[PDB]
Design a binder for these strands. Structure first.
Ligand SMILES: [K+]
Ligand SMILES: [K+]
Ligand SMILES: [K+]
Ligand SMILES: [K+]
Ligand SMILES: [Mg+2]
Ligand SMILES: [Mg+2]
Ligand SMILES: [Mg+2]
Ligand SMILES: [Mg+2]
Ligand SMILES: [Mg+2]
Ligand SMILES: [Mg+2]
Ligand SMILES: [Mg+2]
Ligand SMILES: [Mg+2]
Ligand SMILES: [Mg+2]
Ligand SMILES: [Mg+2]
Ligand SMILES: [Mg+2]
Ligand SMILES: [Mg+2]
Ligand SMILES: [Mg+2]
Ligand SMILES: [Mg+2]
Ligand SMILES: [Mg+2]
Ligand SMILES: [Zn+2]
Lengths: 104, 50, 126, 75, 67
RNA sequence: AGGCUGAUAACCUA
RNA sequence: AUGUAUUCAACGAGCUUAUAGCCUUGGCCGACAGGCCCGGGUAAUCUUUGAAAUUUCAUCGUGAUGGGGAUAGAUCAUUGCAAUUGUUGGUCUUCAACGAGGAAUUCCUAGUAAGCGCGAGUCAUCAGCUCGCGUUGACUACGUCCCUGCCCUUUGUACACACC
RNA sequence: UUGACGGAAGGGCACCACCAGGAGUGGAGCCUGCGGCUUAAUUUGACCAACACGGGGAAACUUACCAGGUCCAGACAUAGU
């Protein structure tokens, strides 16, 4: 009857990601569901380092470009229909929500 | 006409923005030349911190 | 003092099968034939031995010009006259038994050997 | 700069010198014997083992890079 | 003595096809025959041996200046 | 021939 | 230096699943290079149980020597439509200069210099390069305007294309 | 008058300056870039602030150079055959 449902959140914006995570945990604590998380995975730092000059003249200066990806994992012990109800709330822009039935 | 194989090497790949074959950034599947990437970096989501 | 390749005399090399020949060749030609030959290499072999059939008895065959300088020399090509393009001109050679397992590129030099002239202005004080 | 000529095997004269004089050294190492007896370091290493077997010299330190020995009995 | 073929400095000889270890003058004769064969057919590698140039694809603009 | 000089002369080295 | 034994990182990167195109564990075949098979991973999940210098024992013994590994011969395999003017990777052999570098000249003040390896970019194949990462870990100074320059003030100027 | 400059002065400052030092580089072999020479061509930009720089590690492609062969990927409009 009760299953461990895994919700994964990804975003470049920490504040928006943390806001949605709190809305889900707090939205599940209202239904008295058992909640595991949020678990914060290590931040993925995509990095592109490139020559600033469009030509090859001058001092060789470099731009270090970083695109950070933050990932959260929340496990809810409940039925899929109940979880579908909690996650159906409008989510902040740029936060990618992904609901899967944990294979355990 | 265009018979020569184009399965690998610089001749197969080009910049997705401008079409130039040089200095392509293939990391993460960007497929942009280094000049076009710097112009579009902010829009793509890349940022300079240090 | 007849020619022999890997202990096999020239008379037997002509009658040997392609599978038997590849074992005699070094590693690079063996991989090349194992990967197969394309249309263009086949056509050259067809023309090279066609010229031999047209040659009057006792005369060398007529020249066959080709751009295929990655072609490998096989025993069937011994005695043929081939003009090998070097990028500018067709350099003519007569295939000899010691050329077996070499590329045609190795007998048509693509550059002129350097004979130096006097250094110009800007060659020193560097 | 002259070249050293270190013997690779002992001769009767030098071997007897090793058995009599070397036990009296305060410091015994392959390089000490190699220089005093004009023997190669390879021969000195084997010689020190023989002196150890005979009990003429005792060990102070053992390291693959540096071996230190000394006379078994003082003076 | 069961020394394998891959361990020998003359593997699959050009003339005989045999495997052997060639030493002293026989080794010097073998090297002489290799270069004479290439020079005789006017092989590119043989010609560069004859001209005293590098034969293994090295750049020659800046290194090997001993003349 | 090299070095020194933005460069030449001078100077220094080989 | 070589041959053993021993042993500790960090940044990061990874696939179309087509029999399978990326990172590859495990098993088997092979001296190596490499090959075959069963698989994992679109990843804090699998590769990742994840380095070298160093430590340790032995051999070598001041000899251009077991320092050095250029040049060159033979041969094998891999990438590719194609390797010759050697793509690269192996095996045996070959075994050059070089014994610490003239005038001159660069960088650097602490986890720094230097040494040591690793990832990433390029990339079918190719790193002596670049951008990062950690590991080992110092000497000297705590000043000065002598040299090369810079900033401010006063001052001289026939310079203003501005002491080239 | 303002600047710039001074083998003018005063004050201050910097390991792209020095001092005290370390590692070196410059010498050898080789890798790679530049010049010159050669070449059918050895494409080319750049001369502290050019020269492992053009992310430039080019087998083809890249490619601009050289020797050759194709193709039209000549819209649209007017007239003609
Ligand atoms: K040269
Ligand atoms: K070698
Ligand atoms: K030096
Ligand atoms: K540079
Ligand atoms: Mg070359
Ligand atoms: Mg050695
Ligand atoms: Mg570990
Ligand atoms: Mg030696
Ligand atoms: Mg290349
Ligand atoms: Mg580069
Ligand atoms: Mg200071
Ligand atoms: Mg300086
Ligand atoms: Mg100093
Ligand atoms: Mg050095
Ligand atoms: Mg020099
Ligand atoms: Mg030097
Ligand atoms: Mg400056
Ligand atoms: Mg080309
Ligand atoms: Mg072309
Ligand atoms: Zn572009």
């Amino acid at each position: 009857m009760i299953h461990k449902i895994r919700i994964t959140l990804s975003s470049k914006n920490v504040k928006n990601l943390e806001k949605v995570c709190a809305d889900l945990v707090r939205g599940a604590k209202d239904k008295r569901l058992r909640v595991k998380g949020p678990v914060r995975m290590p931040t993925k730092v995509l990095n592109i380092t490139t020559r600033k000059s469009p030509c090859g003249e001058g001092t060789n200066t470099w731009d270090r470009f970083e695109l950070r990806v933050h990932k959260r994992v929340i496990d809810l012990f409940s039925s899929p229909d109940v979880v579908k109800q909690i996650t159906s709330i409008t989510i902040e822009p740029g936060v990618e929500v992904e609901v899967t039935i944990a294979e355990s | 006409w265009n018979a020569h194989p184009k399965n690998y090497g610089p001749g197969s790949r080009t910049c997705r923005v401008c079409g130039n074959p040089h200095a392509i950034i293939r990391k993460y599947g960007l497929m942009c030349c280094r000049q076009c990437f710097r112009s579009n970096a902010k829009e793509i989501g890349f940022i300079k911190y240090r | 003092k007849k020619f022999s390749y890997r202990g096999v005399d020239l008379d037997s090399l002509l009658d040997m099968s392609t599978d038997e020949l590849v074992k005699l060749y070094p590693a690079r030609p063996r991989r090349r034939f194992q990967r197969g030959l394309k249309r263009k290499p086949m056509a050259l072999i067809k023309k090279l031995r066609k010229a031999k059939r047209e040659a009057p008895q006792g005369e060398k065959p007529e020249v066959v010009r080709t751009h295929l300088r990655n072609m490998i020399i096989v025993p069937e090509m011994i005695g043929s006259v081939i003009g090998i393009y070097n990028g500018k001109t067709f350099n003519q050679i007569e295939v000899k038994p010691e050329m077996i397992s070499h590329y045609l590129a190795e007998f048509s030099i693509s550059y002129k050997p350097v004979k130096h002239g006097r250094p110009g202005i800007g060659a020193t004080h560097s | 700069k002259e070249k050293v000529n270190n013997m690779v095997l002992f001769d009767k004269g030098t071997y007897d010198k090793l058995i009599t004089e070397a036990p009296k050294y305060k410091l015994i190492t392959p390089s000490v014997l190699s220089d005093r007896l004009r023997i190669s370091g390879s021969l000195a290493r084997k010689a020190i083992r023989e002196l150890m077997a005979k009990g003429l010299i005792r060990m102070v330190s053992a390291h693959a890079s540096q071996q230190i020995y000394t006379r078994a009995t003082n003076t | 003595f069961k020394i394998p073929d891959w361990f020998l400095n003359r593997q699959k000889d050009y003339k005989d096809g045999k495997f052997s270890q060639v030493t002293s003058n026989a080794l010097d004769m073998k090297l002489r025959d290799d270069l004479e064969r290439l020079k005789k057919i006017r092989n590119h590698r043989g010609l560069r041996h004859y001209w005293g140039l590098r034969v293994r694809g090295q750049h020659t603009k800046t290194t090997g200046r001993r003349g």
